[PDB]
UniProtKB/TrEMBL annotation, chain A:
This is CRISPR-associated protein Cse2 (CRISPR_cse2). It comes from Candidatus Cloacimonetes bacterium ADurb.Bin088. The lineage of its organism: Bacteria, Pseudomonadati, Candidatus Cloacimonadota. It comes from the Bacteria.
From TrEMBL, chain B:
This is CRISPR system Cascade subunit CasC. It comes from Candidatus Cloacimonetes bacterium ADurb.Bin088. It comes from the Bacteria.
UniProtKB/TrEMBL annotation, chain C:
Signal peptide: none annotated. It comes from the Bacteria. Mg(2+) 2 binds at residues 10, 38, 41. Zn(2+) binds at residues 10, 38, 41. Mg(2+) 1 binds at residues 10, 38. This is CRISPR system Cascade subunit CasD. It comes from Candidatus Cloacimonetes bacterium ADurb.Bin088.
Automatic annotation (TrEMBL), chain E:
The gene is casC. It comes from Candidatus Cloacimonetes bacterium ADurb.Bin088. It comes from the Bacteria. This is CRISPR system Cascade subunit CasC.
């Protein structure tokens, strides 16, 4: 969907200083710090003007902070339930696999304002296994409509399909 | 060679430089507030002075079409010239043809000639127009302030390749700063010669080789320009309208030195009549220190001192830190031209 | 036009519009759910609703119960905003 | 009696931070409107004690007050002073209660009872609008050629002088021509500042009719405002104490709604 | 042996270093705002200076094919040398040659000879160029700096092996900071067209403190001996840093001011005297800014000398002021082992202490 | 017997420790942001110092 592609492109065009500014704002809200608010407004407001179906402020802020921390390369078809699920085929089934699965499954009982730390640990698990690509646009689209059952069903089904291979 | 001119001058509040809000310009020096006059004001005052009328051969304008439609005589060339200018690229963001062009008042005839040619295509016509405005730099006022032209590629033509349109400046001017603390005005809310003047220090630097090079090797014109610049700087008021400078110091060096640190400590006087004199004294102090702390062997430095009727001396009453003292401006100009080699003031006026 | 181009808090020249309520969107919009505001007041109102879950009813600047808050937020901007960051858009 | 008030603005400090007070002085119309908002009606103040309702000029008193803006006051700080002379007591705590960022000092007000005898020397400062009314032929287009139109325009334009006369002499003559009528005689007059004053005014313009009826949809169009300003300071002598007091509190020129008429007098 | 240079210098209102928006650079020190000048600006100003001209033999260019073309003569070699540089690994990707090469090697005739040799393959000639680039190591501009290059591996050939390209710089320069609170101001300008028919700029004024550190042994090692060249470099660096300024907006803000105080120290370890200005200098009516700054520096220097004294390594220093204008030990202390009123004798004393060298013969080694 | 050393030290503008991005390290103490120098960096600087050479 147009509106998210340009948002991710603008995020990928940032330089070291803006990435550090967003990095130092992790775990914080949009209103308390002014430089982060100004940077987010400059990056986001024209997109909301031009496109009505642009991502909401909370999801965009969360995605910006996550991208600033992790800095993955955008690639279509590399969504989270595939890389996580292809990784889960190399762990010990008895002990490590349930521990990873519980952390992956905990996301279904949290709202968009509490999905920073679990996503952080999931992306750290990804980074520990030499992963350099991720689908940011797809992740944003899923996170926008996280309160719908078919979205979660498709998420889990994709995870299972990737895992059973 | 580098010609350095230091001046001490008094100015009235009615002949000052103002900002957007209408307040006189001021700066911070030594941690305290001082009065300021910008360098652009001095440059444009010297450019449009009476003594510089014989050396004004430059136009900075955004209306090249109007200037072109003042020589052809035929009324049927205003849209063709505008189209050619747009083809060249003289159009910045928004507006319409608002790029400042700085050239000389002698190649406009060539622009009219190319514009008035109906046997030439538009693209090569624009190329010829650019070639005409890529060499119009034989103006003494351009050789002192420089030029910089960047045509936009937003509406640039197919090829219309541009040449070098950059001229390096040969004159450096610093902002004039008050010697004393800025004096407040009188409040009319406490209600139930007309105003004090302000003392300023001015610094100019001129490169001889750069001025010679920019004038295509001409040498008499450079001397005439130097003399006219000195006379205009000594004999003009920034905005408004004898008021001769109280002290002028002329030096010939190889590296630029600024004596603005002689007034880090402000000059404070109970009596207003002893201001200027004491200011001069401080200057001498600093100069002596520099002349004894930053130069020896290689190439020495000699200087001329000018005061009106020799009213104020700068020699420590014993030191020969000035080669000679001159009581007239014309004699000072003649000596300055003589040091560069010959260049009598009478025979140099026969040049533009 | 109705507000005479005056901000509803500081009475400064107005350039932006704040939506009091979101009963209708796009197709219908009466000029009674909108208020005229300047840049600083609009920014303060935006930063005062980021995580409150107001949904339909947003801040009404005419209500006194918000005034003491809004000015406070404005102060923060005047203390911390950098004009060189809004310029040079990143 | 007369009421004299003083307001102070910083116009300095860090240039990388918002400065609403310094930006407020870029439009003379905004300054005039803000100063006019200091005279509320007796019903508006009761209804709105916090100045948090839409602003309508019909709810504020109309009274010909005068003001001037001075700059360059020192003491290691920059200041812009606004001096207001009125026939009514201003209400500054109602106008700036939500805009305390604008000022750098609390507003001050005081009474003023000027009583001057005949043949008294005074030191005066005042700003004038140098304007004359003329018939001008209408030249238009100028698309490489000037095309004349037969209409003659009645227009107020700037005062001009000859090539052999300085602006100071022209202004001194222009003021001494009218000084018989005002009630004083000049002794010396010198020009300090000569320039322009700019502003912009909104105006409603109809666009489309209302489908439900009872009005239009309307929009705002901006009209420029340009004035020629000249500041003078000098010495005067009172002719008769009757007409001089009429000259004060009235103005000595046009554009009195944009800070262009005010005599400041000191006893010398 | 470590040579430390400290400078106190006052500047007239100007703008010598600005960011992409034209505002002069600033920093935070001691919790307060100060003016700042970047170290790279000072290093480049010293590099491209009249005093430091006889020792300039290094070039940093993004276009090495043009120099080869000029050196070759009237022949054509742009495409061949350009492609050879492509397969050397100088990042052809992104349409830019962003790889900046600091190979000094001003005798670039060797690259021409390899380029102008119609007997070797396109790969071997790419190996000789790489082998000859990484061996210059001369031109003392890289005796003070140098991390010469780091080649790109993805776009290079698989038959070229690079040698070491690290020079281990022997010069340390700190960012200049003001001794007081910075006050930035805006100047408003107008185009003022000529034919009948507001802008914003930034400037400020401050008094700066500058610090330089030179390592003698590393400087000698980087030149492969040649102590005379090292002494010449030290003297020319002192002379250039003493009298030179950044060439930024000097056509409208002429600020060719000279430093008010110079302190030269010899010690085995580096110490910076910036903490003398944690408390910003406030101007009183009985003195000026420079004198108060010099007094604070004197206090801090005396306290540091008394607090960290070791009998196994005494510290020797010289103090220079123009015509002894501003003494260092105003009240009671003879902090400086020698007070000198002229710069040339200061350079001579520095050289004499360093090696007993004289300023005359060391100038005969131009290199 | 335990020996405890406490030091207070002010530094000029610099970058003594960086992360992968190239930004100086930071932390949150008392609810506010502060600069940080890693303990391992201090330990290795002490180990390689000239005073610990012997
Ligand atoms: Mg507002």
């Amino acid at each position: 969907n147009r509106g998210t592609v340009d948002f991710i492109a603008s995020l990928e065009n940032l330089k070291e200083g803006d990435l550090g500014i967003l990095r130092k704002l992790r775990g914080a809200r949009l209103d308390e710090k002014l430089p982060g608010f100004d940077l987010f407004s400059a990056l986001w407001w024209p997109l909301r003007q031009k496109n009505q179906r642009a991502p909401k402020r909370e999801v965009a802020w969360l995605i910006a902070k996550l991208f600033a921390e992790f800095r993955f390369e955008q690639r279509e078809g590399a969504t989270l339930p595939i890389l996580m699920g292809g990784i889960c085929r190399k762990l010990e089934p008895k002990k490590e696999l349930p521990r990873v699965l519980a952390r992956f499954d905990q996301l279904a009982s949290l709202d968009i304002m509490q999905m920073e730390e679990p996503l952080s640990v999931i992306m750290g698990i990804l980074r520990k296994h030499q992963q350099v690509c991720l689908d940011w646009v797809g992740l944003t689209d899923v996170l926008s409509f996280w309160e719908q059952e078919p979205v979660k069903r498709e998420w889990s089904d994709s995870f299972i399909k990737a895992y059973k291979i | 060679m580098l010609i350095e001119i230091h001046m001490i001058q008094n100015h009235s509040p009615a002949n000052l430089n103002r900002d957007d809000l209408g307040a006189p310009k001021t700066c911070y020096f030594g941690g305290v507030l001082r009065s300021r006059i910008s360098s652009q004001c001095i440059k444009r005052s010297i450019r449009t002075s009476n003594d510089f009328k014989a050396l004004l051969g430059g136009v900075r304008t955004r209306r090249l079409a109007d200037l072109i439609q003042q020589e052809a005589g035929e009324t049927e060339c205003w849209k063709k010239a505008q189209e050619i200018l747009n083809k060249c690229g003289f159009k910045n963001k928004d507006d319409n043809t608002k790029m400042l062009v700085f050239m000389s008042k002698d190649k406009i005839k060539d622009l009219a000639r190319i514009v008035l040619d109906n046997s030439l295509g538009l693209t090569e016509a624009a190329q010829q127009v650019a070639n005409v405005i890529a060499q119009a730099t034989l103006a003494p006022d351009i050789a002192l302030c420089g030029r910089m032209l960047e045509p936009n590629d937003k509406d640039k033509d197919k090829k219309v390749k541009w040449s070098n349109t950059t001229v390096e400046a040969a004159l450096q001017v610093a902002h004039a700063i008050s010697t004393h603390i800025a004096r407040p005005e009188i409040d009319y809310f406490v209600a139930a010669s007309m105003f004090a003047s302000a003392c300023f220090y001015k610094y100019f630097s001129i490169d001889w080789e750069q001025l010679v090079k920019n004038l295509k090797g001409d040498t008499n014109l450079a001397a005439h320009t130097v003399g006219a610049f000195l006379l205009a700087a000594a004999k003009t008021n920034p905005s408004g309208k004898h008021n001769y400078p109280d002290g002028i110091l002329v030096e010939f060096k190889n590296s630029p030195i600024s004596y603005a640190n002689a007034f880090v400590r402000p000059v404070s006087v109970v009596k207003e009549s002893d201001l200027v004199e004491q200011s001069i004294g401080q200057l001498s102090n600093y100069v002596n220190d520099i002349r004894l702390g930053y130069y020896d062997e290689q190439s020495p430095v000699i200087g001329f001192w000018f005061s009106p009727n020799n009213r104020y001396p700068l020699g420590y009453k014993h030191s020969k830190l000035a080669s000679r003292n001159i009581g007239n401006l014309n004699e000072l100009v003649g000596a300055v031209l003589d040091y560069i080699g010959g260049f009598k003031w009478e025979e140099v006026q026969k040049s533009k | 036009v109705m507000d005479h181009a005056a901000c509803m808090v500081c009475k400064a020249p107005a350039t932006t519009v704040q939506h009091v309520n979101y009963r209708r969107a796009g197709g219908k919009e009466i000029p009674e759910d909108l208020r005229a505001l300047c840049r600083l007041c609009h920014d303060a109102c935006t930063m005062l609703e980021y995580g409150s879950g107001m949904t339909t009813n947003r801040i009404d600047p005419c209500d006194p119960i918000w005034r003491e808050r809004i000015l406070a937020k404005r102060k923060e901007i005047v203390e911390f905003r950098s004009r060189g960051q809004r310029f040079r858009k990143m | 009696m007369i009421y004299l008030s003083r307001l102070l603005i910083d116009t300095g400090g860090n240039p990388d931070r918002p400065r609403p007070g310094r930006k407020w002085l870029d439009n003379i119309y905004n300054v005039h409107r803000r100063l006019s908002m200091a005279f509320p009606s007796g019903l508006r103040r009761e209804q709105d004690p916090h100045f948090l309702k839409p602003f309508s000029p019909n709810d504020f008193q109309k009274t010909p007050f005068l003001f001037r803006v001075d700059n360059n006051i020192d003491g290691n700080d920059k200041r812009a002073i606004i001096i207001v002379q009125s026939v009514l007591e201003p209400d500054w705590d109602y106008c700036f209660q939500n805009a305390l960022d604008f000022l750098a000092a609390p507003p001050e007000t005081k009474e003023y009872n000027p009583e001057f005898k005949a043949g008294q020397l005074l030191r005066f400062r005042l700003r004038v609008n140098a304007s004359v009314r003329r018939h001008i032929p209408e030249m238009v287009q100028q698309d490489g050629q000037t095309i004349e139109t037969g209409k003659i325009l009645h227009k107020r334009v700037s005062l001009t002088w000859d090539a052999s006369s300085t602006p100071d002499q022209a202004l001194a003559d222009w003021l001494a021509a009218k000084s018989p009528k005002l009630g004083f005689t000049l002794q010396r007059c010198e020009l300090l500042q000569l320039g322009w004053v700019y502003g912009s005014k909104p105006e409603p313009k109809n666009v489309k009719v209302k489908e439900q009826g009872q009005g239009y949809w309307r929009e705002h169009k901006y009209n420029p405002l340009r004035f020629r300003a000249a500041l003078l300071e000098g010495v005067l002598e009172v002719d008769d104490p009757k007409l001089f007091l009429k000259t004060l509190s009235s103005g000595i020129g046009k554009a009195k709604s944009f800070g262009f008429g005010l005599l400041s007098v000191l006893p010398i």
